[PDB]
Design an enzyme around this catalytic site. Sequence first.
Site, PDB file in Angstrom:
ATOM      1  N   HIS A  87      56.804  -4.681 -13.846  1.00 55.41           N
ATOM      2  CA  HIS A  87      57.855  -5.683 -13.660  1.00 55.41           C
ATOM      3  C   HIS A  87      58.346  -6.277 -15.005  1.00 55.41           C
ATOM      4  CE1 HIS A  87      54.596  -8.800 -13.062  1.00 55.41           C
ATOM      5  NE2 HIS A  87      55.296  -9.279 -14.085  1.00 55.41           N
ATOM      6  N   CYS A 100      51.127 -12.583 -16.877  1.00 59.59           N
ATOM      7  CA  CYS A 100      51.056 -11.211 -16.375  1.00 59.59           C
ATOM      8  C   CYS A 100      50.605 -10.219 -17.435  1.00 59.59           C
ATOM      9  CB  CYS A 100      52.349 -10.786 -15.700  1.00 59.59           C
ATOM     10  SG  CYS A 100      52.888 -11.933 -14.414  1.00 59.59           S
ATOM     11  N   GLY A 117      54.048 -16.099 -17.940  1.00 56.54           N
ATOM     12  CA  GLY A 117      53.663 -15.353 -19.135  1.00 56.54           C
ATOM     13  C   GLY A 117      52.281 -14.729 -19.073  1.00 56.54           C
TER      14      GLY A 117
HETATM   15  C1  LIG Z   1      57.309 -14.079  -7.579  1.00 62.26           C
HETATM   16  O1  LIG Z   1      57.003 -13.472  -8.838  1.00 62.26           O
HETATM   17  C2  LIG Z   1      56.724 -12.132  -8.853  1.00 62.26           C
HETATM   18  C3  LIG Z   1      56.702 -11.311  -7.732  1.00 62.26           C
HETATM   19  C4  LIG Z   1      56.327  -9.982  -7.863  1.00 62.26           C
HETATM   20  C5  LIG Z   1      56.005  -9.463  -9.104  1.00 62.26           C
HETATM   21  C6  LIG Z   1      56.053 -10.260 -10.236  1.00 62.26           C
HETATM   22  C7  LIG Z   1      56.395 -11.602 -10.118  1.00 62.26           C
HETATM   23  O2  LIG Z   1      56.400 -12.504 -11.156  1.00 62.26           O
HETATM   24  C8  LIG Z   1      56.237 -12.027 -12.500  1.00 62.26           C
HETATM   25  C9  LIG Z   1      56.165 -13.227 -13.396  1.00 62.26           C
HETATM   26  N1  LIG Z   1      55.158 -14.168 -12.934  1.00 62.26           N
HETATM   27  C10 LIG Z   1      54.573 -15.039 -13.755  1.00 62.26           C
HETATM   28  O3  LIG Z   1      54.829 -15.097 -14.957  1.00 62.26           O
HETATM   29  C11 LIG Z   1      53.611 -15.968 -13.134  1.00 62.26           C
HETATM   30  C12 LIG Z   1      52.386 -15.502 -12.783  1.00 62.26           C
HETATM   31  C13 LIG Z   1      51.371 -16.336 -12.236  1.00 62.26           C
HETATM   32  O4  LIG Z   1      50.297 -15.912 -11.795  1.00 62.26           O
HETATM   33  N2  LIG Z   1      51.681 -17.668 -12.133  1.00 62.26           N
HETATM   34  C14 LIG Z   1      52.914 -18.218 -12.478  1.00 62.26           C
HETATM   35  C15 LIG Z   1      53.132 -19.589 -12.378  1.00 62.26           C
HETATM   36  C16 LIG Z   1      54.364 -20.117 -12.729  1.00 62.26           C
HETATM   37  C17 LIG Z   1      55.387 -19.292 -13.148  1.00 62.26           C
HETATM   38  C18 LIG Z   1      55.187 -17.927 -13.260  1.00 62.26           C
HETATM   39  C19 LIG Z   1      53.938 -17.378 -12.956  1.00 62.26           C
END
Ligand SMILES: COc1ccccc1OCCNC(=O)c1cc(=O)[nH]c2ccccc12
Lengths: 304, 304
Positions: B41, B145, B143
């Site tokens: 992603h 991921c 960030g």
């Molecule tokens: C709905 O998002 C996705 C769905 C499928 C696939 C990927 C998705 O996101 C990718 C980006 N995610 C992050 O950076 C993220 C990961 C996390 O564990 N907590 C967060 C808390 C606040 C803001 C962001 C995050």
Amino acid sequence: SGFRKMAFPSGKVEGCMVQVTCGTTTLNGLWLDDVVYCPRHVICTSEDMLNPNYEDLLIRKSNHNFLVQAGNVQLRVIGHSMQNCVLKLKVDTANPKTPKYKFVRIQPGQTFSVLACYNGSPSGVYQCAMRPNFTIKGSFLNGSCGSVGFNIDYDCVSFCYMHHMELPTGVHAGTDLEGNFYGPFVDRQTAQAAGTDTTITVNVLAWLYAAVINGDRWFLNRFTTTLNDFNLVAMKYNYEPLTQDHVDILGPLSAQTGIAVLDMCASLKELLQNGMNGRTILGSALLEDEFTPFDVVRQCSGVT
Amino acid sequence: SGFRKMAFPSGKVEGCMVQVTCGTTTLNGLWLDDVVYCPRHVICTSEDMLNPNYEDLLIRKSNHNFLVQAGNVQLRVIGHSMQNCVLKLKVDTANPKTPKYKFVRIQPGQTFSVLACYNGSPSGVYQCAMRPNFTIKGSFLNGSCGSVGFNIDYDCVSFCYMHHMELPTGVHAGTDLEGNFYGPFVDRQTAQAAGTDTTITVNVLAWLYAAVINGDRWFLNRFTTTLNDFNLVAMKYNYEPLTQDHVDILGPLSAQTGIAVLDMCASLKELLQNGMNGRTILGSALLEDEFTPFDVVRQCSGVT
Ligand SMILES: COc1ccccc1OCCNC(=O)c1cc(=O)[nH]c2ccccc12
Ligand SMILES: COc1ccccc1OCCNC(=O)c1cc(=O)[nH]c2ccccc12
């Protein structure tokens, strides 16, 4: 989201761990620059531990009696000295992996990460807090002495603890990196009872703010309190008194959540008086006090 | 003595973390040998995330569109491919810090350490478990991921998890290092509800053995039970069924404490039916299930 008991990444400290042997005793040492720090009780036999005279025992030891091994290679000891309860073994080689570092003496309530080591090899890393009775509730077995506690600020490791002993009650005692014990503990096998292990109030409030930031809000009530009223309740529940310094330290968490510190104090007061009622906060059925306001902000902001 | 939620020392994994940027998205990558693994992603814009066609989005990307930075130095991408939900970026330089490693796919109930990273930099390390609903209860922000989960056996790092997303309920989902999600989750921003988060029974029993080894024995009763009777209670309390494989795995903890597995099962049965009554076990007011029998033995024996 999510809130975990998080330790600092331990790589910078793993590169400092060495094995120190004196006679039949093997424990861990910390190698920074050309000095290896370790608990002075490395010179003691089991019999010595009951009533050791460290100055006298040290006279019978020479540089060649301290065997220092970093990985599978032997370090040459060219000097040795006792600073309070630690020995400083001067070696002929500076640790190539020495990170930027400081020696700090922490206050009760402050948290740190421990890298539990055996035979100079790291086995695990976990988060601790210096308890208000100057003990730590660690996880340490035979051979763990010389394992260290630390905090990291970007690339600077601030060493704050060196493990020395387990009290008869299963709690732990140790020194700062200058060899001074936290609390009234001495490196002797004698009756040493710890004082009241009170709860670190400012940390519980910080963790309640972390819970609100992470969506766990059931405990928020319609009440407020004063510092004096809250402290009457805190004393009754063996919680540390909350000061205006603590309220000021909680300022940014209060701003982030929109919940005044004294309002959160009233929520905590009701949690103390009513209990959890079988409910949980951030996956815990008790009020967690080993997260400082700085740890909550760091974890909830992503400081690397 | 003492029992802590202990993570593996993270140094070996810190030496593998890199930053991967594609377009405006920056996440973490894992650099082993001349390959950088990261969630696919990374190629998506926020709009793309709602219904991404990864094969189609990848066609518009070339090697020079994947910016890989290890520390403050840039790595040259000479190849790129998609394996399930991960991208494998071939770089021209083998990671000099590549530890001995394996890619494993863990089963629910198994624990691992996570090195939470942001911008290719490690921020913290904590212990997790693969939940029976195939989620993990991590601590991850924007960030994070590409942060990885791992276990260490002496000097071999077994990578088992790579972070991909947070579900709307605040729990986490990700893949093994072959890009296959744990559970039924997909890397798409859609309604994905997790199943029942049952308690890992074998882990609770292992942690009860750890409590007995560490002196916390109040919960030990005068009763025993059978696997079938215990499982009737376990089903009622949303605990995983206990099998004879679990009983066999608990054999060494049973031998160490002298407490037959089925006797400990009866103690756990009474704890479920009666509750804690305001008491604690190893500093917890609930039954901890994120320690495997192997973790209890490792921590209680000092494996490095
Ligand atoms: C709905 O998002 C996705 C769905 C499928 C696939 C990927 C998705 O996101 C990718 C980006 N995610 C992050 O950076 C993220 C990961 C996390 O564990 N907590 C967060 C808390 C606040 C803001 C962001 C995050
Ligand atoms: C009473 O001992 C000392 C008193 C003063 C000073 C030093 C003393 O011990 C030095 C050796 N201690 C350990 O190796 C040890 C440390 C620990 O935290 N847990 C253990 C659990 C089981 C067996 C041993 C330990």
